[model samples]
Target: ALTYRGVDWSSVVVEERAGVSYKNTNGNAQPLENILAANGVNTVRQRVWVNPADGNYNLDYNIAIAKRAKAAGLGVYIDFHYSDTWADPAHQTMPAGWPSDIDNLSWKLYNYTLDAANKLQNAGIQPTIVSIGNEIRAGLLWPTGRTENWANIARLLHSAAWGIKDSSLSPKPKIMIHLDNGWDWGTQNWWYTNVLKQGTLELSDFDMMGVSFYPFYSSSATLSALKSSLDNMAKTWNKEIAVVETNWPISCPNPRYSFPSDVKNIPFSPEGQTTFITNVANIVSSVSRGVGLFYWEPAWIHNANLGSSCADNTMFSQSGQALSSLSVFQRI
Candidate 1:
């Protein structure tokens, strides 16, 4: 759904060649696929919505993109927001018309999750990892199973895990319980404690611990602080760690969220981003338990058509312009 200039969305490639030598095998030379592979980016993360009006976020749309990523030999990480649109730390609203009752809601979640995972697998597109929800800080399924209702939340997660397992896919996809605010270890500790206290649940059933880290939002700390946090998490949680969502603005366009204007000790320049990556990478690599870092929406460009009306009601402003900060991927 994202395009370049005015070209068809798929026409944009990692590299471009001139006349006569212009054979578009995978669009351009060193396509993003190639760049990522070269840079040790062996996986691709994609989000799937149940039923979006634009049809761009549906299963079929997701599968189509999966095929593209697969074609480029990248492992896929399918993230199910379980909503019609973006679902995150602040907003975990259930999909439109989902049953309010616990039993029925559980059933719907299980069946739909299983069916979607199975469908992807059957299409020879099994995801390497599956996130039950996205940036779920408060919890998912809303009023019924949110926050303090760890009892029902755990049950729902277990049921969804069951669906994922039932799909009969070889090498069952690793399940991940994601939460926002990666820098705040307290949030992570609290959420996991709540889930763990609920039952035995073999916390290991969940393969990875996912977190979202944004220097701007996390109160840009020094390299020392970053290292300390990563070390703290590695010592506390005995699982692979992933910075699932993170971004830095390249310029000061939006001041409300304190985008570019907020740059202080944090890296705001291209070199700064690379340095940030190197420092974080060293910390994670040193720990040996840190899996990888996922720079969230690094490709979101400034456009007039990116956001929608629905986005306005939620925490995210529904403007169409992509942040210039995301272009850091090109630098990386």
Candidate 2:
């Protein structure tokens, strides 16, 4: 039984600041969390940065939004990007002026994580799940923690694990090591193979393995490949697995990047979006160890500039009306 029905609402940190808001199933405008709760979204994921421009996604901002998710009776999943901005398979740039030495950087990472966790604890928002870094396929903290240096990566990951474990929260949050390309078996296989080398990160410490999958995430990614990769991953890793990120567009013509028309035969319409979510859910649930998946920014109804490329992918229309796909999490 998949216990979690999640959504990543991290975009709202700056979105609401720009007057971005959402509406429920009806045309009535309401809080984003309210819409999520009504649609069977049980968990909410939010990302945090070390020190972003204008202190965006800072502990203060995260706590504020987390409070809202809690008030809506949704569990929180904290995604620690550990970078100034985005951190993913390709980019894991370290924050400016921290440290170049390996040990110093490890301490910095540990200190920052503990501080954030403590702050969140003090704010009365005990996150249900916590990821050390976002899409850490290449590893986090730049030159030092890259995949080429597995020893350093292990040390850094160990530090993050300890930090979360030692936090003040009563029940420690379930920890995850998140990576991108959910449907690629090679990258994940190689990553864990190296990271768990003798005297490296231990499997007992962390709690979950997360992967991001999007049919339109990249030109080569397709919905056809998601299931096999997930099934094989679960059969091998033996850890709790979650599709920490996944979404599809209801309509297309994204100017930012072109996805092949044949990627998914499903049409780019309301029924198609709902079907895509249903397909993803059924595939993940089929795996013996599969837990659940999180929809990326379901309520991120955006303006022409705020979400031009992602305008079609959200669960809300351009004008903030909740689409029919929002109900997919209910039974399957």
Candidate 1 at residue 253, lDDT?
37
Question: Against the unseen true structure, what C-alpha lDDT does each candidate score?
Answer: 0.61, 0.82
Candidate 1 off by > 4 Å: 1-35, 38-40, 220-226, 253-267, 303-332
Task: Give the alpha carbon lDDT tens digit for every residue of 1-332 in model 1.
Answer: 11000101221121121111221123344344444444444567878888888776688877876787778777778888888888876777888889877788988999999899889988789887788988877888787668888877887787777789888667787888888766666677788888888783457668777776655443443445545666776787677776665544343333334322233655444455555555555555565377766655433332211231111111011222222322333332
Give the alpha carbon lDDT tens digit for every residue of 213-284 in model 2.
877656656555667777777788688888998877776766466664444577777777778777777778
TM-score (C-alpha, index-matched) for candidate 1? 0.78
Give the best candidate by TM-score.
2
In model 2, where is the ten-residue run with the lowest total lDDT?
Answer: 302-311
Cα displacement (angstroms), candidate 1, residue 167, comes to 1.2
Q: How high is the lDDT of residue 144 in model 2?
A: 92
Query: For every model in order, what is the number of clashing pairs?
Result: 8, 0
User: Candidates' TM-scores?
Assistant: 0.78, 0.93
RMSD of each: 7.6, 2.3
